[PDB]
Ligand binder design. Structure first.
Ligand code: HEM
Ligand code: HEM
Ligand code: H4B
Ligand code: H4B
Ligand code: K8F
Ligand code: K8F
Ligand code: ZN
Lengths: 420, 414
């Protein structure tokens, strides 16, 4: 029916969802099977694999233009009807259409607003949008990305931003950032078989080396940018180091911590996702905000197939590592996340702890149910990866559904690119 | 059809075919996922019972490699007679044991299922009064407790008939601590149990008004008014909580009971409904250490522990809550191990569950699992289940929720 309730089991607040009635595409679940913990549950996309026919693209365009003109209290106005007819002609004569600046901004902000996996969405309407649709080469992509990084970093007072490159046309002329984030550290396969640096990035690191990058072969080597424009072969660029803000990790109590020689970068900037607005696909759309401390201290530092530094911290702390039941992993994990937050705050680099972020999200949910009739949210991703049940989102029921505009996953370009 | 599930830490990929056997709803639709809803969303007629019974008997005779046998066909014949004549039927003892074990094996929210086939089943279907239920439950507690070497067990009371004669254990668990709200708004004891404590006091219980009063059993036989019984205190094994490094921890006066024993769920086997079926295992430490002690609506001792730890409790970003939570959970595990009372830490348990899950995919074609419940309430991503994709679906026999009995019971006396 016309409503589904969600309950918080701590406060007994009940919210009533009607926004899900506007959901467009499949979650992957059914009556009989829930796919809520599948990373990529569904391949349901809104238009086929490349350049659609008119009957495929125009309905999606009309739906978005309708939604945008409703959003600004028109619908049916002179400009709405003209825009429809203008999109109609543009598709007739080019097989696609071009978004207005206002529509582009509306679409980007609503993709963030609709991102059910993102705990940071209370900030969704404060997003700086850089229109990079006039770009034609990898050199121009590099210039746009450098300006984004400089604006977003803002000497540590971080600012959310997205830079949007030309949309897909036929699928052979894609713009792509091959990096998964604008700033990541290299990972190196070692002679014995261990890994130096960040193990997630071993393959991408090897592509960069195989493209002519000379690796300094350290533990915190900022990877080059690997940029593809208009379907051509990708090109390597070194981000100027003065644009890459980094934080040395120290601990407020353990003076030995800084001798671990750890650091991390300040700017999280996802660059491998696809932005979908009214049937248009922006395959290069790097966006950035600021970290929740656990993203560094829990996942980046302590995943087994990542930096895996729990061993060292625990040793220096003189914990019993004979058996799991001493909870030495849990104890070192806390100290590391204390140190990360203390270090970012000491250097006045924007960062949020998982207690503050999750409390912000409960408040965001309440705002969204009050003004919008709902808020799509993926509990599996929203609950932080440590200390789950002492955060308020753990006890919050959530409904997950897919709204458009949206951010989507896309295949890695090196599986699909035909080299020249 | 097949569905694949991937582990993103190990890259292992498993193939689920067992989901084709599912039947009831998950609650999700093709366009909305309700995977984090706690409870998504009167007795069966003859026509409804026939196919439910058949499916169960079919699955039982398949499990014992007797499908299609003369004994299979005769059991089906016999079951349909009973349904036809009496509007219900009676499980054989073998079927009851198999059903009980498979409800556990099918419990998608339970991380402890590697143990599912070692379950001691106590058949209590001959019971007729609350005194009889008390006797059965006492024997269950004593067998399961086993002087600290805990053994999984379940006791199964008579099935529902017309819904007007249900057997129920009114307690949510066999052993729990009372909670008392004070006139000044504070709480003594376990805040989760305030409501049920009130019900007991009203039924005539004389409460000690301490921090760790074991609640009485409130037992309902054959739809009559429930009756109060005190579990003999020497059957309730308890563990005083101390910490291996903080000698002051013992001065918090904390203790917990050793036997976790859920008593408010419904066991469904072949369409038959067993509304009183208390079952018990042994604890994962975080059930006590994270939830029982550190939930805000529970004993809520993060404050005192962090205070005695001298933590900076002004800013959240000092992570004092996280730091104190770990120490409480260290204390819980150390205390049980010292007293040789069975317990498992969340690292050992999630590792065992991954091995169980993989074995289940191999021999059975899958393993329904609820990630939201399987991932422990602390240190999620440093356990192996966090990175394990899982499929959730409902197989029968199963354990289900049922309404609380004080909401539906119509009283008889005065
Ligand atoms: C401003 C501060 C922000 C914070 C604190 C934040 C927080 C987070 C966190 C913790 C995650 C989980 C990431 C992971 O565990 O891998 C996430 C995911 C995500 N965020 Fe945000 N975010 C912020 C800004 C943004 C912005 C500006 C956008 C887009 C314009 C965005 C879009 C997304 C998307 C699409 C995901 C899902 C990514 C995926 O599925 O891999 N976020 N966010
Ligand atoms: C033998 C040791 C066992 C361990 C270590 C164990 C562990 C757990 C844990 C940690 C949970 C989640 C509870 C929570 O966090 O609230 C759970 C749930 C559950 N367990 Fe097990 N369990 C064990 C035995 C059993 C047995 C013997 C049965 C039934 C015969 C059973 C059936 C269930 C069910 C039905 C649930 C879900 C309850 C609900 O949804 O409220 N478990 N178990
Ligand atoms: C709202 C949310 O579904 C709820 O808090 C769940 C989350 N996961 C859980 N997981 C376990 N093991 N036990 C619980 O009580 C809960 N509670
Ligand atoms: C299998 C599981 O869904 C997967 O590991 C998810 C779980 N939850 C997550 N949550 C966040 N925030 N980020 C992640 O990468 C993941 N990984
Ligand atoms: C914009 C943004 C802000 C933030 N604080 N965090 C993220 C996520 C960082 C990268 N995530 C790993 C993944 F690939 F899953 C996405 C993105
Ligand atoms: C048999 C069993 C063993 C164990 N170690 N733990 C439990 C769970 C205790 C209570 N659980 C909360 C709930 F209501 F969901 C059920 C049950
Ligand atoms: Zn679902």
């Amino acid at each position: 029916p016309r409503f589904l309730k969600v309950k918080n089991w701590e406060t007994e607040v009940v919210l009533t969802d009607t926004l899900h009635l506007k959901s467009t595409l499949e979650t992957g679940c059914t009556e009989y099977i829930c796919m809520g913990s599948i990373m990529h549950p569904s391949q349901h996309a809104r238009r086929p694999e490349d350049v659609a026919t008119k009957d495929q693209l125009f309905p999606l365009a009309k739906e978005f233009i309708d939604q945008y003109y409703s959003s600004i209290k028109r619908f049916g106005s002179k400009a709405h009807m003209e825009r429809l007819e203008e999109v109609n002609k543009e598709i007739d004569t080019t097989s696609t259409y071009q978004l207005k600046d206002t529509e582009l901004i509306y679409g980007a902000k609503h993709a963030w607003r609709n991102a059910s996996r993102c705990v940071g969405r209370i900030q969704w309407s404060k997003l700086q949008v850089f229109d990079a649709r006039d770009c034609t080469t990898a050199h121009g992509m590099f210039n746009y990305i450098c300006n984004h990084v400089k604006y977003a970093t803002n000497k540590g007072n971080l600012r959310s931003a997205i830079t949007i490159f030309p949309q897909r046309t036929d699928g052979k002329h894609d713009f792509r950032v091959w990096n998964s984030q604008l700033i990541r550290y290299a990972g190196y396969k070692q002679p014995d078989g261990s890994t130096l640096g960040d193990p997630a990035n071993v393959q991408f690191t090897e592509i960069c080396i195989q493209q002519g990058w000379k690796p300094p072969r350290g533990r915190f080597d900022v990877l080059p940018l690997l940029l593809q424009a208009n379907g051509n072969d990708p090109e390597l660029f070194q981000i100027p180091p003065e644009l890459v803000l980094e934080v040395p990790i120290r601990h407020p109590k353990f003076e030995w911590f800084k001798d671990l020689g750890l650091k991390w970068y300040g700017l999280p900037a996802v660059s491998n996702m696809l932005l979908e607005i009214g049937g248009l696909e922006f395959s290069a759309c790097p966006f950035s905000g600021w970290y929740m401390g656990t993203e560094i201290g829990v996942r980046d530092y302590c995943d087994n197939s990542r930096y895996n530094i729990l061993e060292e911290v625990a040793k220096k702390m003189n914990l019993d590592m004979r058996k799991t039941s001493s909870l030495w992993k849990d104890q070192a994990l806390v100290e590391i996340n204390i140190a990360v937050l203390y270090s970012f705050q000491s250097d006045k680099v924007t960062i949020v702890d998982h207690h503050s972020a999750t409390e912000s999200f409960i408040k965001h949910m309440e705002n969204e149910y009050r003004c919008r009739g709902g808020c799509p949210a993926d509990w599996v991703w929203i609950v932080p990866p440590m200390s789950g049940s002492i955060t308020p989102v753990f006890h919050q029921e959530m409904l997950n559904y897919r709204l458009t505009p949206s951010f989507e996953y896309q295949p890695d370009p090196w599986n699909t690119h035909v080299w020249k």
